Every structure is written in structure tokens, then in C-alpha cells.
Design a protein around this ligand. Structure first.
Ligand SMILES: COCCc1sc(S(=O)(=O)NC(=O)Nc2cc(Br)cc(NC(N)=O)n2)cc1C
Ligand SMILES: COCCc1sc(S(=O)(=O)NC(=O)Nc2cc(Br)cc(NC(N)=O)n2)cc1C
Ligand SMILES: COCCc1sc(S(=O)(=O)NC(=O)Nc2cc(Br)cc(NC(N)=O)n2)cc1C
Ligand SMILES: COCCc1sc(S(=O)(=O)NC(=O)Nc2cc(Br)cc(NC(N)=O)n2)cc1C
Lengths: 318, 317, 317, 319
């Protein structure tokens, strides 16, 4: 039977017999993603170039913010684009806290590289007046998370307790079609992904691990290398093909570069629901308790055999 | 004034006072590229999954049929076809087209950027058309370019008048001129290659990449990017500057990329943009091919970066 | 605040504290409507004409499959099917849907506006659904409406809460709420019927039309419009006011339009918008059908106009 | 073999050995029609209604056609339904052609989503004097090309030239007009008549009798059907496809009709004649009227030749 994102979420909600707020939230986010996809693919660019005589990251943030505010399902919104948490006005408050990066990778969008939207959804835990503190939950508390990848096609990957499911946007009809059900990552991959241009700054553990991938001590084939430079594209390839993605700490950047709340945690959650792993080196990404909504974290994620091998090398230098 | 691909090509053809065959060819290829973009973005995928109860093959069929029906071509070389295609006599025109209809599609399962690459020659011999008419050096190209199906769809077209970039507006199905007479940066800050083959690299490549990560002059190290899809990696090189490398390795002792419909079209765009493209021993555009699917090593990009690599290459004889 | 069809229906369903079946039904229909619109605007026609080397049947297949797979329906009545379709047991829900998947398609050769019409009932039986579950008067309708594939695509949905109009934004494939709680004008200035059959008219219809062209009180004559596509003519009546007629005559004592999936949904829309819909003898919604494909005369639109017609009909006993 | 509008126009142009100006004109107009279609179908309307937290369609359509024609370098004088005076193209952008157009015909009722359309007629400038409004005052017989785009259930472009009438369907998935009906001809006699019968009190007596003959034929044959969309492009395209007759005739209140000669009547009369139909004012061929004002009106009766001839017989009976 054909299935769509909306119909899929509704069916899961009916099984759980929830109130419907989470379904309204996801439907609103789905509408925002279709509008971002349309803008990213440059619909209407002819009018900007004068056929008849707002930047993408700003527009993307406005779409997600406005669709989430008007869903009546959220109370606190944390965005990569905003210094402070946004508190939904009282008449529109619902029960969820949403952390998101509305257009990840957009710094290099001038070269038409894949870009994406990342989101993580938490339940507000206290009855206190909503505030920035409500977003300071460990990733283990996520109720749902995922990403939209605007690549050669647009796909939404949605992770929940029931697993990870992948939906392809059919732009002819504006519907997300379920195309990959209950996806699991390979136990061990053949690709490693990181910015090797910064090798002079590498932690000694990262240097040794990468050397073993290129010069295996036994007779296995060296791994292939890929680094798009857009987190959503690199993580999605890691999910589909297996392997390992690294944005690790070094001494210049002792906490890494990627943001914990709206980059690392949603991707770590997708990975764990697909049977993968996600570590800071010292602990699971999902176990870090944040103290700042924009705090950074190191991240190494992907196939479990590859992540465990990195942790072996990391321990060796600890 | 706004400009479109069709109107741009027509105006250039009128200036040159040609017969119109090349304009008909390019218009036909433009139509194929829009149809490929629609399929790559998965229009109609709901019907395949039962709402009412392969991509590289379709892409090849689109380009082949639109080029045959243009009446402008006589010999067609495709990555997808083992032999050159000889256009039937009643549809024959004067141009030879070499193309890769969906480059990078081996990894399309992860939604990586993919693209279409093409190079167009005037048939040079007066012999009956045959595979030999496609064996010209890239220096003989009349036009070349690529369509990138990335976050948006863009067509990059290089001719004697330079390199011009057109964005497909999917609301109206028109390629809009957005970047005119493009030139590559003299020196970039990104290097692009699959370092997974480090064990197989020749010493010149090894030393060069070492210089990018550990500069002797205490300058900042280069960043690394490698999409694994040639059109995406080359387009970033064009837009941002830098260097792209696919050297020979043990699996690929003559290189991996195809000379006729990957290396030559990209080298032509690079040189018309003021960049460089070398095999290490000679300019890519100067290689005389003997086989339509033959491979070549390639290093291309900003001139100062390619010149620095050639300096290291000279050092190792 | 912006609103969409899906979010609007979900909010109304949550207010009503229903089980969710009707919302799933409407979402599935909305997907079918978007797929029908795409085909009607001829997306992909280049492939039918050979770029790489039925419509009413497809429309019926889209509606049937999306409704079957919604798990919300048990009996489906379509203009396209001689007998009611009984949903297989594991996919059964509690609702009966009567629909015309592509009304007006006989003249789609001239690109006239076409549409989809639907009416939704709760089933009457407590087990063993059958065609009898579709033989309900229109008064039993829970929801009804139509999609108009006109210059743009619009979905009009009528429920107890009133009538709401949603424009399909094809750039994002979303139905946007653009007209809330619509009410028809009390009196219009347009009448709509096929005057080519004037020879067969009931004397009452003859007199009423004469009053529109030669008003007795020196008011302005009405304008005439007749698209010949019921959804287009009824939507114009809703938006502008006025009156639409497909009346009974001696050759066709029960009219031409079908009661279950043309007259009843349009009459329900009209009544929820403050209009009227009559057969001449009784309200359309009060007719108890005995056959799923039975015909009915229909006169609908602005209340002052329908009441003026009924006054003339009364005079002719 | 598949054919597109661009490939069709180029091929006809190559045969004629022209300079390419008309092809550039038609391609620019084709781009304009695609952008009008996108706007008419409401692409982007979600932004107007606040999805992220601006100009009327007839104004936008005029701006699109005007800007694309000016930038084609193929035109010198432009007449639009929307502008009181002819637009004279600035000297560095001038070409040899005169274009008359209605950028969005029928938009008065676009609130109810009725079919709308774009109508155009193309003339060669005839005099060697500085271009002016007078260059647009040519009879329709001087037309080089004319046609219309119908934004109906699908978008179709009908293009008439010396070689006949050809119909192209816009495939919105790829933004290309695909040739779907070649060298179209209208039926010799139809079964549908089309006019606003609500104004019957004001009819000319000849029109009253003709419509009387359609509903109550003297030989007891079957009556004609009636259709009137109220959008000229929709009603005329139906007349072309199904045959029959379309009337917007003169009366005493409107002795010159209501439709505009230069950018409604003449282009449609030209399409009809190239398809083997007829188009008359009652007194003369529409294409033979020599205009004196760019916005002058003309009565028009057009369609299947046998139906128009029967109208003319009734019209002659009433002198
Ligand atoms: C960790 O959560 C994952 C699972 C969940 S729970 C929710 S929900 O939004 O909280 N509840 C919800 O949609 N309920 C719903 C919707 C409709 Br329509 C009908 C009925 N019927 C009834 N209640 O009898 N119920 C969504 C998802 C995906
Ligand atoms: C290496 O070439 C780069 C430049 C060229 S040359 C050609 S072409 O196809 O050979 N000639 C061509 O389009 N002619 C053309 C087209 C049109 Br419309 C009108 C007229 N007018 C006339 N002939 O008076 N001529 C295309 C391009 C881009
Ligand atoms: C004349 O129509 C009356 C209006 C109605 S009633 C229905 S419905 O489908 O029967 N019920 C329904 O959607 N319930 C729903 C949906 C979601 Br999400 C969450 C919850 N929560 C919970 N149950 O706690 N409930 C749809 C419409 C438009
Ligand atoms: C009024 O119907 C007459 C038919 C006509 S004439 C024109 S045109 O624009 O005047 N000439 C034109 O397109 N020439 C053209 C274009 C291209 Br490409 C190549 C060559 N070749 C060459 N010149 O050798 N020529 C268009 C149409 C449809």
C-alpha cells in the first residue's frame, strides 16, 4: 500500500492514542520543508533577474518559525539563526520544545552543494513558565528527530521510537512518499568522512585512526574518503552506505565545532534508532547535559564497528 | 536585461551568422537537461509506489533522442553505450557529441549531486561517419559544459565567447542567465581528491597534498572537500577556486575519469574560465585519443594551484 | 495565521474529539486531488509524445486507491463504476463516499475546466457493508465538496462548521486556506443553463428565463453563462451569486445530473453557504434514492433567485 | 518524432531563410506565456497568505509580455489592452515587428477560476518613418503571425502562420510546449452556438432570428447546444476544436461591438481563417477592417463556415 508522511504519522499517533499535537507539529514542519525545498531549487529566480522588468537562510528560518508557532504545538523554539530561545506567545503554546537548523550547509550554497534542515523535538518537562532552560535536555529525551536533505532529490528522514523511515518528496504533487521503511545502518562501512585539510591540528588519536583507514595493518582494502562539507549530506550518505563521519575535538577546539542541540543530537538520535552509534569520544552524544543552547560538541558517528574502532584508538591516547 | 539560454545562444549564433544547426543542437540538449532534472528530482515517483493502485538509462534515452531528432548530429558517444552511435542518414547533421548523461549516478542512492557533461565537435573528416569522428583532441571543441543537479539545477556553457552560467527556474522551466563571462580565482583554498588512495599515490601527489596540509610558509592550510561526483567537485572549483585531482592509482593505472566526455569538457570549461587542466605530462585538451572510453588522470582548477602542482611534478622528473 | 487543508481538518477533528477516520479520509482524498490536478495540467505529456524515444480512468483509479488505503471507507460509489465497490474487509472503515472523479471530462478536448465532486456519509449497517449504505438522502451528509481544476486548482469543502475554500499552491503542493466560512450572495445577476434545449423546457422554466431577459420591474437583465462543466458553473454561482439550472422536462422527467455524486454534494455546499437547491418539487437533499446512478433535476444558487424560480414553478401547478 | 515550439519555429524560420528576428520574438513571447501560466495557476500563493510570516495578475502579465518583447530586440511598437498609447521601443532595442496583444484576456472573472488567456498579433512595420502608433493601424490581412495561449484545464498555445495552425501543450514538469495537433482545421458545420443570451432584449433582429433558428429549427432537426464561458479565448478555442459559431455582435447600443479589433478580433479571425473557418463583422471580413484607433471595437461572428454563412443569410434578410 502506498503511504505518505502525513498518513504514516497519523497512523502512528492513532496507535499511541495521543492527543494529536505531535502530529500537528510534524505536519506543520512538513509544510515548511516543502516551502524550503521550493526556494532552494530556485523557483521564481526569473523574477529576481528581471523577467517582468530575502536570503535563503533567513527565509528558511522564517518558514520553520512561522509554521511551528502557528501549529499550536510548541512553546519554545531554539534555532541556529537566533541568539536566544524564542518563546511562543501564550495563545499559541503547545507542549513541545523544538531545536532546529533551518538550512544547514548554506554557507557553501553558492556552489549548489547539498543543503538540509535538521530538527529535534522534546516534550517540555515542567509546568514552569516556558524559558530557555526548557531546551537544555539531553538528546536521550528526544521524542522525534530527523532531517530534510535537499540533494539531487528532496528526502525527509524521520526517527521516532518506532525506528527510522525515509520519505521522498514527489514535487509533481507535493507529497512525501514513504520509500524506505525501518532503515538500519550497516554494521561496518568502507567510507570515512572528515575535513583532512586541518590535519596539522588533529588530535593524535584522530591522526592514527585516519592512518589505519588509509594504510590498514592487514590485507583489507583501504577505506574510500568522502567529505561534502554539508553535515546533512555526509550523515545521510553514512546512513545509506555505512561508514564513519567525524567532526572531532582538537586542542584549538576542545569541544568540537558542531552545535549540540540542533546538529549533533538529532543526528545522534537518527543514528541510534538505525542501530548506529554517536560519541563525543568521552561519552555518547545523547548523554551530554547541555548548559547553553548554542554549546558545541565533538561528534563521531556511523556504523557501530567503525565507531567502536575509533573509540579503541581514542582510548589508546587517553 | 534578463536573458535566457535559448535567447543567449540565438544571439551568439546570429552574431556568427551561422546556419543554425548548433543552435538547434543546444536547444535540443537544453530540453533533455530539463527532462533529466525533472526525473532526478523524482517527479512522478508516487505513481511508481502505487498511488493509483532506471534513471541513467532514461537520461541516456532523453539525450540520444533529442540529439538525433535535432538533425544536427552524425556521431554520438555516450558513457552508457559501448559503441559510438551513428545517426541514421536522413537525420544527419555536422556535429559530433560526446556526453555522460548522468555522471555520479552510481552513488545516487544517497541523493548526492549528479550531473550531465557534454562536449560538441564539428565533424572533421569527410569520411562516412564513424567512431573515428569522435577521436578528436579537446582543443577542437566547439562548445562544452555541464548541468549540475545539485541543491538547484544549473547549466554551465563554455564557448569561444567564455563561460556562462544559467539557473533553471522550475516554476517556468527556463534557464536564466545568472553569471556572465565567469573567471576562476587565480588561487584557491580548497583541494579536492579521494585521499583513500593515499597508499597508491605517486610521490608528486603525496608531496603536493602534504604542502596543502603543512604549508612551508606558515600560511593557512587548505580545506578539503570531495563530494565523489565530478560535476559537483568541478563546479565548486569553478565557483570557489582551488584544485581538483583524480590521479592514476593501482586500480586505475591510466586514471579513472573518461577523457572524451568527462575530462575534455571539464578542461575546456576550466581553460575558458582562465583555469588550467593537466594530466601531469601535458594539457588534457592536447591528448589525442585512440579509444572512445579511454581514461585519463586529471588535475584542474585555479592556475596558481595547478602551476604549483606542476612544479612539484617536475621535481620528481 | 496561515492555514492549510490538512491542519484545518485536524484542528476541527480534534475539537470534535472524533476517532480520526474522517481526517484520514480527507487527507487521502486531498492527495488524490493533487495527483489528479497534476495529470489534468498534463505533467509528463512530453513522454507520451516521445521525448525519450484515459484521464477519467486514471482519476477514478487515484480516488479509489487512496480511499481504499485510507482504512476509513467501506463502500465507494463512482460515476465510473456500474455497481458500488465494497472495500475488502481488512481495509474497511465506517464511511461511504460517492464521487465523480473527473466531472466534465467528455469535453476536456477543448481544455474546459473540469473537477472532482465528493460526498461522504456514515454507513447505516452495523456489519456487511453493501450498496444499500449508499442509498441515503443528502441530508445525511457529513462532509462534501469539490475540486475545480480551472485557471488554478481550488478545493471547496463543506461541513457543519460551514464552507471553506483552499487554493492549491503547486510550488509546494499544499492547499492554502484563502476563503473562510463562505456565504453566497442573497441575490445574483447571472443565470446558467443550456438554452439550446429551449424547445423541451417546462413552461415554468420558460417563464423564469423570460423574466431574466425581460425583467418586469425594469431592473437590469441578468447575464448568461454556461460553461457546460458542472463544477465550473456551480463554483461561479457560489463566488458571484446567481442561479444554475439543469431542470426536468418531458423527455427527461428526472433530469440529467446524477443525484448521489453530482446533485447532493453541490446542494450540501450550497445550503452550508446559505444558498438553496431544489428539484422543483422538493429540496435536493430530501430525495431518498433507490438507485446509485439515478438522476435528479436541480436548480441551485442564491436564495432570492431560487425562491423566485419556485414561485413561478408554483404558478404552473 | 517529438516536436517543441522552439524547434518548430526555428525549423520554419530556417526554411524561409529569415534573419531570426521573428524566431527571437516568438521565443520571448513563449517565455512570457510560461511565466503567466505559472502565476495564473497560483505558484507561490502560500507566501501571500503568510507562510513565512503582491501585484495583480493582469498588471503582472502586461509587465511580463512587455519586458520580454522589449528585450527581444525584434519589436519597435507595442500595443496592449492595458495601455492607452502604443509603446515605442527605445532605439537601441528596436526590431522590425509590431505586436498587439491582450496579456490576460478574461481576467475580469478570474475570481471564479474561469479559463483565461493571452492573445497576440504580429505585424511587420510597413513604413520607413520613425516608428509610431500609426504602424499598428494595419488591417488583420497584414498579420505575419497570431495566436493565443489558453490557461484552461491545461495550458495550450495555438500559433497561426502562413503554414497553418498548430497547437502546443505546455508540459509544466519541464517547461516545454509540445506539438500535439498539427495543421488544425475547423469542422465545416458545428452543433454549438455561443453568445450572451442574457442581453436578448438588446439583440439586433437578425441575431434574434438566427438564435431562434438554432433552438427551433424550421425542419424539425435537432436543436444546437449552447455554451458561453464568457472568456473569449475559451469560447473561441472550443469553437476551433468542436466547430460551431461564436458571436459577439453589434446592436444599437453598441453599433461597433464590444471586443477590440487589434488584439482580440484580428488575431482570432486570423487563426480561424488559417484553420479554414470564417470571421465577419456582419458587413465585412474582420481582417479587412482598416483601423483608425488602436483600441477601436469591432463586432465579430466566427467559426464553422456553414454556420457563419447561415448567420449571414439571416443578416441579409434583415438588410
Ligand atoms: C513518540 O510518539 C510517537 C507516536 C505518535 S503520538 C502522536 S500524537 O500526536 O500525540 N497523537 C495523535 O496523533 N493521535 C491521533 C490522531 C488521529 Br488523526 C486520530 C487519533 N485517534 C484517537 N486518539 O482515538 N489519535 C503522533 C505520533 C507519531
Ligand atoms: C562556435 O559557435 C559559437 C557561436 C554560434 S554559431 C551558431 S549556429 O547555429 O551556427 N548559427 C546560428 O545559430 N545562426 C542564426 C540563428 C538565428 Br535564431 C538567426 C540567424 N540569422 C541569420 N543567419 O541571418 N542565424 C550558434 C552559436 C552559439
Ligand atoms: C463534520 O465533521 C466534524 C469535524 C471532524 S470530526 C473528524 S474525526 O476524523 O472524526 N476525528 C479526528 O480527526 N480526531 C482527532 C485527530 C487528531 Br490529529 C487528534 C485527535 N485527538 C484525540 N482524539 O484525542 N483527534 C474530522 C473532522 C473534520
Ligand atoms: C512568418 O512565417 C515565416 C516563417 C518564419 S521566418 C522566421 S525568421 O525569424 O525571420 N528567420 C529565422 O528564424 N531564421 C533562422 C533561424 C535559425 Br535557428 C537558423 C537560420 N538559418 C539561416 N538563416 O541560414 N535561420 C521565423 C519563422 C517561423
Amino acid at each position: 500500500d502506498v503511504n505518505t508522511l502525513t498518513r504514516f504519522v497519523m497512523e502512528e499517533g492513532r496507535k499511541a492514542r495521543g492527543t494529536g499535537e505531535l502530529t500537528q507539529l510534524l505536519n506543520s514542519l512538513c509544510t515548511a520543508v516543502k516551502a524550503i525545498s521550493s526556494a532552494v531549487r530556485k523557483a521564481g529566480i526569473a523574477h529576481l533577474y528581471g523577467i517582468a522588468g530575502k536570503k535563503l537562510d533567513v527565509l528558511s528560518n522564517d518558514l520553520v518559525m512561522n509554521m511551528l508557532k502557528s501549529s499550536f504545538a510548541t512553546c519554545v523554539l531554539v534555532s541556529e539563526e537566533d541568539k536566544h530561545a524564542i518563546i511562543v506567545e501564550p495563545e499559541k503554546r503547545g507542549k513541545y520544545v523544538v531545536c532546529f537548523d533551518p538550512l544547514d550547509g548554506s554557507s557553501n550554497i553558492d556552489c549548489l552543494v547539498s543543503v538540509g534542515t535538521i530538527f529535534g523535538i522534546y516534550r517540555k518537562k515542567s509546568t514552569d513558565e516556558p524559558s530557555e532552560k526548557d531546551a537544555l535536555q539531553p538528546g536521550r529525551n528526544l521524542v522525534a528527530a530527523g532531517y530534510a536533505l535537499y540533494g539531487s532529490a528532496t528526502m525527509l528522514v524521520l526517527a521516532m521510537d518506532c525506528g527510522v523511515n525515509c520519505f521522498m518528496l514527489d514535487p509533481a504533487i507535493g507529497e512525501f512518499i514513504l520509500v524506505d521503511k525501518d532503515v538500519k545502518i550497516k554494521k561496518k562501512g568502507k567510507i570515512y568522512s572528515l575535513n583532512e585539510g586541518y590535519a596539522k591540528d588533529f588530535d593524535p588519536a584522530v591522526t592514527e585512526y585516519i592512518q589505519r583507514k588509509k594504510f590498514p595493518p592487514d590485507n583489507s582494502a583501504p577505506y574510500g574518503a568522502r567529505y561534502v562539507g554539508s553535515m546533512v549530506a555526509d550523515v545521510h550518505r553514512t546512513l545509506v552506505y555505512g561508514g564513519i563521519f567525524l567532526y572531532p575535538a582538537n586542542k584549538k577546539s576542545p569541544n568540537g565545532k558542531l552545535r549540540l542541540l540542533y546538529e549533533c543530537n538529532p543526528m545522534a538520535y537518527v543514528m541510534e534508532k538505525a542501530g548506529g552509534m554517536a560519541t563525543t569520544g568521552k561519552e555518547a552524544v545523547l548523554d551530554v547535559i547541555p548548559t547553553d543552547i548554542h554549546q558545541r560538541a565533538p561528534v563521531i558517528l556511523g556504523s557501530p564497528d567503525d565507531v567502536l574502532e575509533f573509540l579503541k584508538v581514542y582510548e589508546k591516547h587517553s
